[PDB]
Each structure stands twice: as C-alpha cells, then as structure tokens.
C-alpha cells in the first residue's frame, strides 16, 4: 500500500498541499449562497454553456437529504466522492438516531473528512469547497461553508469559486434584513451577485431554492429569465 506523506509542513509553517488544493477552488465555477428568512437560495455559474450538453448531468447543486442540499466549487470528480459520502452519512444518522440530521451535523462530518485527507498517508487533499444549506427541525435557515483544509463556518451569505472575492464584497454591502424581506428579494439578491461576475449573465446561471418543510426546487430557463428581467 502507498503510505507516503503527501501533506507536510514547510519552513514558514505552511501546508503546501492544502494551499494548492485551495488554488484549484479559485479556478472553479462561482457558487453563491444566501440565507433568507424562510428560504435558502443556492446559485451557481455554469462556465460551460454548451448547447450540445445535457444540463441535467452536470448540475452543481445536489441534495444530501430531504432537508439538506449543497453546492461546490473546484474539482468536480472530488465533489462527487464527497457528496456520496455525505449522502451515506445522512442515512446512517437517520438509522441510529430517529430524526433527520441538522445542517451543522453534516457540515461537521464533511469537514471532518476533508481534514483527514490532509493528515493521512498516500493521499492528497480534496480540491473543493462546499456551501451546505438547509433547514433544521425548528425551521431555521442554515448556511455553512467548508474548505479544503477542513474548517467550516456558518454564514449569512457566501460565495465560493473564481469570483468569490468580488461577490462577497458586493454581498457585504447588499445583504441586509430588508434585502431578504421575502422569498423573491433573496432570489433577486443571489442573481444580482452572480450577474456581476458571470459572463453574459442570464442563461449561464443555474439556481435552486429551498423553503421550510419543502424539498429542493431548481428554477428553469424561464423562471430565471423573469427574475433577470425584473432587475432591469
């Protein structure tokens, strides 16, 4: 078996492998997340907008369970592995405990796995960042964000990917308690943040939503075109 240490410390106390894994996330597609009052929005920028491509097989916004869903940025092949592990953990938590997992519980589990790949032999770190969003049993909108290192934080509105610095900056001076007043202003906020970074904004912006006690819904080409015209 391969047992060589891949991630090790450097002279100035840096884990090069983890920093190189975070560099891959910056080259990935932009994915923003906004936490509203009774709604959670996840928007992703479809870099490749090929017309010969089946859009249903390249989606970035998945579902971990009935109340938890997530988006990612970076290596697509790594994300799938992580998402499948998180899905298996959700069913395991529904078996042992007789209740659904909380958004922080699965975020903690995904972060725990990521950290393990940064301190194990014969394996490199995951090159993705996740934006776990969902609702707890009480009906509270949660928005967490994990990264390659294995550190997770709960946010109010966050963007990950290439144009995350810009989106975040724009979100900082746009996300208020009046900007997320309803279930339409939150959607208009996610689309606004994505529109200032996504080339030819409009048809290159997939976005799903999640309301309290409700599965996950993915707005289509027409639904999202009405929100993009409303803004103007």
């Amino acid at each position: 078996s391969y047992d060589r240490a891949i991630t090790v410390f450097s002279p100035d106390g840096h884990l090069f492998q983890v920093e190189y894994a975070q560099e891959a996330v910056k080259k990935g597609s932009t994915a923003v997340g906004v936490r509203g009052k009774d709604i959670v929005v996840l928007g992703v920028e479809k870099k490749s907008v090929a017309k010969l491509q089946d859009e249903r097989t390249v989606r970035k916004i998945c579902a971990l369970d009935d109340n938890v869903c997530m988006a990612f940025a970076g290596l697509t092949a790594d994300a799938r592995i992580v998402i499948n592990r998180a899905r298996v953990e959700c069913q395991s938590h529904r078996l042992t405990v007789e209740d659904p997992v909380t958004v922080e519980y699965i975020t903690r589990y995904i972060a725990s796995l990521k950290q393990r790949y940064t301190q194990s032999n014969g394996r490199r770190p995951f090159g993705i960042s996740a934006l776990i969003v969902g609702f707890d049993f009480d009906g509270t909108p949660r928005l967490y964000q994990t990264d390659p290192s294995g550190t997770y934080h709960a946010w109010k509105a966050n963007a990950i990917g290439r144009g995350a610095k810009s989106v975040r900056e724009f979100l900082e001076k746009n996300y208020t308690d009046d900007a997320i007043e309803t279930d339409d202003l939150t959607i208009k906020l996610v689309i606004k943040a994505l529109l200032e970074v996504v080339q030819s904004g409009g048809k290159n912006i997939e976005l799903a939503v999640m309301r309290r006690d409700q599965p996950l819904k993915i707005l289509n080409p027409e639904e999202i075109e009405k929100y993009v015209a409303e803004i103007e």
């Binding site: 078996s1 391969y2 047992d3 060589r4 014969g122």
Partner: protein, 228 residues
C-alpha cells in the same frame, strides 16, 4: 516492495517506460509468424554463436497447450515468466470450462498480465513482444502481444531485429490461399533476409500449428525444409 508506479505519463502523453521496453524488443532476435489457411507457422532465429552452448538445452518456440504455441522477441528471462503464466492461465480455463482455451481468450488473459506491469508499483514493463498461434474450431489464429499490453490479429508479421524490412517482404510474398507447407518456406525465407551467416537445422527454431495441434519441428524436419 515499492508501492508507487515506475511507469508514469510524460508531458506529451507518452509512457516512456513502455516505449523503452519496445526498444528492447526491437533489438531482439528476429521472429516470424505466418498464417496460411490450413495452419500457422512460427519461426525464430536461434543463433547461440559460441559453440559450447547446447542448442537443444533451451527453446524459443514453446507450447502453451495442446493447440497453442508461443514465440517471442526481446528478453529471454522475461519470456519465461510469461510462458509460465500463459500455461497457468490455460490450465485454469480448462478446469472451469473443461475445454481447451480459445487462442483469442488466452491472448487477452496474457495481455492483461502485461498491462499490470505497466501500472503496478515497483516494477518495470516486460521487455518481450509475443507471437501466439493456435487452432480452434477449424480456424488458424495468429496474435501479437507487445510490452504495453496491446494485442493485434495478424496474417503474417515480423518481430525483433529488422522487423520493418521483414513486414514489407512478408507482404510481397503473402497469399490468401496459402498452404502450411508453402507458408513454412516463406517464413524461413523472411528469416533468411537478415540471418547474416548460414541458416542451419539448429540455428533456427520453427513451430507449426494446424488441426492436429501445436508442435515444435525437429532438426530432421527443419533440415528437409531448409534444403528445399
């Protein structure tokens, strides 16, 4: 042992180790395979050129089973491992299906083993190209498995030293409706296009494959074929 791969991808998308293993086969002794309707014939240059060496001691043309024979070009020691694996792979197949393994089935199983050495840790690729012949369901078969693990079906092919000039000459003499006897003459003729000195009864090894199974010709037999 090492757990990492010794054969990796280069910037251009080539596996140098596999490509360097093909250079070892190219500098090897010339081998000739010819498929002629009613059978297959394997011929190889066996010049020990030292006189003390016992010609009958070792063999280049070996039987894998009752209907399958083997020939090679490149490293002799590597060829012995593959021959032993091929014999084991054939016996395993016969213990499950109770019927001689088809030539095509054996060539795939042996090529799978050669592909394993180009991806496993702490090992180099085999430096030997194989030429397998067989006879199943009233049909002659001739295959060629190289160091990378790829295998092709041939009608007539040259191996080892001067194979580029062996193919051209082989293609200018090959005929669709050719009999085994006439195929055994063209196989020796193409082997005599780079034999330097004089081809003798124990200077080259010939193996034929027909409906009666695979068998290595003898000195007496080769002598008669060499005179004509």
């Amino acid at each position: 042992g090492y757990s990492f791969s010794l054969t990796t991808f280069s910037p251009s998308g080539k596996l140098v180790q596999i490509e360097y293993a093909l250079a070892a086969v190219a500098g090897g002794a010339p081998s000739v395979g010819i498929k002629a309707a009613n059978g297959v014939v394997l011929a190889t240059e066996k010049k020990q050129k030292s006189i003390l060496y016992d010609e009958r001691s070792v063999h280049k043309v070996e039987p894998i089973t009752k209907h399958i024979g083997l020939v090679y070009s490149g490293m002799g020691p590597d060829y012995r491992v593959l021959v032993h694996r091929a014999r084991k792979l054939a016996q395993q197949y016969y213990l499950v299906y109770q019927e001689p393994i088809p030539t095509a089935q054996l060539v795939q199983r042996v090529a799978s083993v050669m592909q394993e050495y180009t991806q496993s840790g702490g090992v180099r690729p085999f430096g030997v190209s194989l030429l397998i012949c067989g006879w199943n369901e009233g049909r002659p078969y001739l295959f060629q498995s190289d160091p990378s693990g790829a295998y092709f079906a041939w009608k007539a092919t040259a191996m080892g030293k001067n194979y580029v000039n062996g193919k051209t000459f082989l293609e200018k003499r090959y005929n669709e409706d050719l009999e085994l006897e006439d195929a055994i003459h063209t196989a020796i003729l193409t082997l005599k296009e780079s034999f330097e000195g004089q081809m003798t009864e124990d200077n080259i090894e010939v193996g034929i494959c027909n409906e009666a199974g695979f068998r290595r010709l003898t000195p007496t037999e080769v002598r008669d074929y060499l005179a004509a």
